[PDB]
Design a protein around this ligand. Structure first.
Ligand code: 8Q1
Ligand code: 8Q1
Ligand code: PLP
Ligand code: PLP
Lengths: 398, 82, 71, 126, 396, 81, 118, 72
């Protein structure tokens, strides 16, 4: 009994594309067979759907169908890539390279590996959020077994130079994994052009169903990986357990739709992103954009509104579903790119998706300008600066 | 030529898309149909036209089913809808 | 009102009200293609909360035709 | 976000500032922006020791804003002695603050005390 | 072409329309991430999630806080076995399980053996049930975990779970059970059965595929090392986005099951009896695998003498069934000492919530017919019917 | 009231008969039958009202799920001739 | 596939003939047991052939087509059977190709009786 | 064409020799109200009709049902 707020949080999750649901429902109603039942049609048709979906994912990323392994999500996928490569080459190589802005599942997998006696190097990013290739080159060691860098950041939408990293890891004979959860279906990906050895894919980030993902494990020059989920040997023994047919069908449908609609979606999402940022800045000073605007996915916009607290502004926007880069600690990505401590609490993340309308954008810009102005009239920092006081005024204490 | 079939189909798809309860699906569907037809207007190959038409019919079925489901499990409107 | 057709068409085809003469055709005078006219007949159905069968809808090619149909 | 924490937020009482150069105004500027919350609370004291006016400006979440707004609201017509007995716990209970949001009440109280200390520090001889 | 009848409920079950009707709102409008704490799209999703958790808990007699959502009973079994084992590694390196456990349990124990653990695989008696004396005698000072499944997925035998609970409690050993085939079909009280961990699969109780749950007792806290590293969702026991539509589906399925359990058990009992009784009065040399006294009537495994499993399944082009033929024979059937020749002559009938008596009678008819025919084609049937003893001839 | 109960029985049976899926149809019909027939000798008015309310909710479910089944229908079972 | 539940020459001959060959190859522990019987003409040609096999549908088909092919051939033309021809003729995958081997093992075994029965 | 004597015969589980035209469903044919609702439904299935509660409630005897079908 109340109007719902606008959804502007696409990086956290996306709605089902009605085409995807229409693809799934038959397997939620009549085709409920187990894809591993080899002795009857209920199984044959289900398996058929599954392999078809596998082909769809493969076509979206330029891989062979045999290289796609179905998982529960990009989290499991990242665990499989990192822990799989790490555990497999343990007897001979115990060093990994990743970055400080990677998703928490990558970082925490690396954490547990450190607990098991592995050596991890977390590459720092530049102020722009992009890594320094020279540092990656200098970091690789003889016993380096894996290099993991994410394609698109989920907090500031920065695009890492995936191809160049592929070159380096190839010429240095080191496995390359990438967490493409925020890039699949939004920007082009060719595993061969980018010389990628493992890739993580999340279904519910591309308007597919929740609880299903995929991991690409290159087979061309075979990449070896130790499986984590023990069982009956499903998914080439890389992921035992019953393959959830409706979910994988959904994933395939989402990847096919994305393959078709990518250019269109990117054109109009680019337009909307420009509209939002341009309009907000032409009306509010001291709003900085986190992330190099040259290498950036326009769907994810992180803005720091000077002198206004994140939670307060989010609460003033009770009509727009937003986020502020998350627990009870500050954003580690914003600290990694060296954002001033004071501004770490003054950033929010607008997500412009496939279904976002121009009305939604202009509305969010309205409430944003209005409430940033109001909260600035209430802010003691805005008063101190506008009154000539320098933020280096050690009158701080607790 | 194929003008009649294409137009009647355009009518069916727009009119049916307008019945989405969810704001996002409705707006997206309408805008997408518009942009699509307007972009594929200058196609002369009849085989390419027939391909586009067949895909358009399948998408029509999808739209019907999904609008009906959306109505069965509907929710409240967005603040933007007044 | 009743000639509020002149509003619909005006906003639908994006043309100043001074151009929506009763004797003005959608395609020739108001410069619209057939897709525009499909959207237009639909818009009329939405406004007056009616339903124009395809038989008589094809006839609607001029402002006076629409006004005559609604009345 | 309790109902009251809603009402004091974007419906706030006494948002502004007084003249820090008065000998009758007490300014407490407590907090730190790296930690998230910064409260500036000012008061005006009567010849008879009553608080006649009070304003605030805080940088922080809606709960901290509520704590500060309710703070100035309460400190209005009380004596400097009757004000020192605010007790953050009374603020929290009056606003229904969960555990993770309890720091705000502390900052508010530390503000009241700080401002009173400024005023009492301006009244001393030379 | 007309579709065949479904008799393979142990492999998977269709969605109960109530479960789908419960899910769809979260597949359409309530697409919020349950971990988005800053807007309604997240709050409503989380609410649905906790509601489902309470539903599962009520079905198994547990506290809501003790339920952890997983991707399926496979992940649950990995979490229980490898989690418990890895956590108490510093002091206990021995595990006890049985030879009839599901392959995910057996293979988890295998990998643990690769990690330096010792596993004891109890044999089952000819009836498929374990010997409690053998289980007590198996426990060692460094035994950290005992894993026994509630109901077997191949022969439907019921293990004496409660007594195992007593034993493991009095010996201070954690008790885990893979109840994937028992939830919603037979009663389960985690406190009465003194259970420390339990695996739950959604698509075995007419819930959606790709979702499961694990019960980890908190009363006498059981510590478990998490396998999936991440942001700390599910109390850090199972990182990753909780798929709300799936968990909602699972909760609805568990509640529906809690309501319909008695009814389903009555009618499934009737149907199972009808099937077995009718089949045996018409075909000689038809053996039922599993102690008929302690057996869940939903899973019936029968050995049809002198007929190969695959051939019979193929003659039943009208009924979706399963067997345990060969690229290896059923290890459950070997564990209960089934004659080697008969290991290839067994099939598995599953009678579910929606199975109709018509379906049963059809399966009985076609089954008798094609077993008779294939017996006319069988050289073994000729050898026995022609007085030669199959226990003597030279093979190969 | 008795009238409401009877009409409800009629509605639930007639709507269940419309399931496309053979299993869903048979189960729905039989379950409604056994359910009503089982609660026939209930005298408690509160229990009667509760049962009726649950029956109404399940009726809504039956409607929606029947429509869904019709939208995504498939071929019949060999058993249906 | 076509030969299963559509079999050619399913049966048995009289093992007491001095002109009929009975080959019973296989084993029930391994899964497949093929019994192939043949009748030899005065001119050394195969006059009839029947079979009875215990195994999957692939072994059954291999046996039906087996007897069908061993029908009008000379004792010499049978020794050149080669299971591979069976595999190609039925398009059997690797895991089910073993049946062809058993099929071959059957033909020779029957011949082994015939040459041993003469 | 009172093949109703079959429907009722199968519906209430009573031999056709019992279906007297002057026999009431509850008194004579020994059926409860649920049985009778299922009965009107079944008749609708056979003769492919639709009896609103107004005229359906009246159906209490064989002659009533046969007469209704003949009309309508
Ligand atoms: P008018 O000026 O009289 O003429 C109209 C037409 C276009 C028929 C005529 O001008 C013409 O150009 N004819 C030749 C070209 C032609 O036939 N084009 C047909 C294009 S068919 C097409 O574009 C199908 C695209 C389908 C997109 C549907 C989007 C699905 C959205 C689903 C939302 C969930
Ligand atoms: P009549 O001859 O007058 O008989 C008297 C009757 C029974 C009609 C009535 O007066 C009476 O005696 N009532 C006593 C109690 C009662 O009326 N109970 C009625 C409600 S009980 C009920 O229907 C339980 C709910 C059934 C739900 C079906 C679930 C199926 C779900 C399928 C989903 C796929
Ligand atoms: C959202 C997200 C995930 C989570 O994927 P799941 O399928 O929910 O497990 C993983 N990685 C990244 C970068 C994500 O943005
Ligand atoms: C079916 C089954 C499983 C599979 O559960 P998933 O969700 O597919 O992993 C696990 N254990 C048992 C005993 C099963 O019967």
């Amino acid at each position: 009994s109340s109007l719902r707020p606008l959804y502007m949080d696409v990086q956290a999750t996306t709605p089902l594309d009605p085409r995807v649901l229409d693809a799934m429902l038959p397997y939620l109603i009549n085709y409920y067979g187990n894809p591993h039942s080899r002795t009857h049609a209920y199984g044959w048709e289900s398996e058929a759907a599954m392999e078809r979906a596998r082909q769809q994912v493969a076509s979206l990323i330029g891989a062979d169908p045999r290289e796609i392994i179905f998982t529960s999500g990009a989290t499991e996928s990242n665990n499989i890539a990192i822990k799989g490569v790490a555990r497999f080459y343990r007897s001979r190589k115990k060093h990994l390279i990743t970055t400080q802005t990677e998703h928490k599942c990558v970082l925490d997998s690396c954490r547990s590996l450190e607990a098991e006696g592995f050596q991890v190097t977390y590459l720092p990013v530049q102020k722009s959020g992009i890594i320094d290739l020279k540092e990656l080159e200098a970091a690789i060691q003889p016993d380096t077994s894996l290099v993991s860098v994410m394609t698109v950041n989920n907090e500031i939408g920065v695009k890492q130079p995936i191809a160049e990293i592929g070159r380096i890891c190839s010429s240095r004979k080191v496995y390359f994994h990438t967490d493409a959860a925020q890039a699949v279906g939004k920007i082009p990906l060719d595993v061969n052009d980018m010389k990628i050895d493992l890739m993580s894919i999340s279904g519910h980030k591309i308007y597919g169903p929740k609880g299903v993902g995929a991991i690409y494990i290159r087979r061309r020059p075979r990449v070896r990986v130790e499986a984590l989920q023990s069982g009956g040997g499903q998914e080439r023994g890389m992921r035992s357990g019953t393959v959830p047919t409706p979910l994988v069908v959904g994933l395939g449908a989402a990847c096919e739709v994305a393959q078709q609609e990518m250019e269109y979606d990117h054109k109009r999402i680019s337009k909307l992103s420009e509209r939002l940022i341009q309009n907000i800045m032409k009306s509010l000073p001291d709003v900085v954009m986190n992330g190099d605007p040259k290498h950036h996915y326009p769907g994810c916009i992180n803005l720091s509104f000077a002198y206004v607290e994140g939670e307060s502004l989010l609460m003033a926007l009770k009509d727009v579903a937003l986020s502020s880069g998350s627990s009870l600690e500050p954003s580690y990505v914003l600290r990694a790119i060296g954002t001033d401590e004071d501004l770490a609490h003054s950033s929010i993340r607008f997500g412009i998706g496939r279904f976002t309308t121009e009305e939604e954008v202009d509305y969010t810009v309205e409430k944003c300008i209005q409430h940033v102005k109001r909260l600035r009239e209430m802010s003691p920092l805005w008063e101190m600066v506008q009154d000539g006081i320098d933020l280096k005024s050690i009158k701080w204490t607790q | 030529s194929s003008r009649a079939q294409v137009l009647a189909l355009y009518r069916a798809m727009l009119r049916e898309s307008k019945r989405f309860s969810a704001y996002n699906y409705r707006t997206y569907a309408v805008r997408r149909i518009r942009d699509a037809f307007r972009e594929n207007k200058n196609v002369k190959d009849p085989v390419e036209i027939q391909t586009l038409v067949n895909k358009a019919k399948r998408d029509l079925g999808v739209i019907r089913r999904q609008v009906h489901i959306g109505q069965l499990y509907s929710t409240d409107k967005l603040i933007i809808e007044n | 009102i009743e000639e509020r057709v002149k509003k619909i068409i005006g906003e639908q085809l994006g043309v100043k009200q001074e151009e929506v003469t009763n004797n003005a055709s959608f395609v020739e005078d108001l410069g619209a293609d057939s897709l525009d006219t499909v959207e237009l007949v639909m818009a009329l159905e939405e406004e007056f909360d009616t339903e124009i069968p395809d038989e008589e809808a094809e006839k609607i090619t001029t402002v006076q035709a629409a006004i005559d149909y609604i009345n | 976000l309790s109902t009251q924490v809603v009402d004091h937020y974007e419906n706030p009482r006494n948002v502004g500032s007084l003249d820090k150069t008065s000998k009758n105004v007490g300014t407490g500027l407590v907090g730190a922006p790296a930690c998230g919350d910064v409260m500036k609370l000012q008061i005006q004291v009567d010849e008879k020791g009553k608080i006649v006016d009070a304003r605030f400006k805080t940088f922080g979440c809606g709960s901290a804003i509520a704590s500060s707004s309710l703070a100035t609201e309460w400190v209005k017509g009380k004596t400097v002695e009757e004000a020192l007995t605010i007790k953050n716990t009374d603020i929290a209970k009056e606003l229904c603050l969960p555990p993770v949001k309890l720091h705000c009440s502390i900052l508010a109280e530390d503000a009241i005390k700080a401002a009173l200390a400024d005023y009492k520090l301006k009244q001393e001889p030379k």
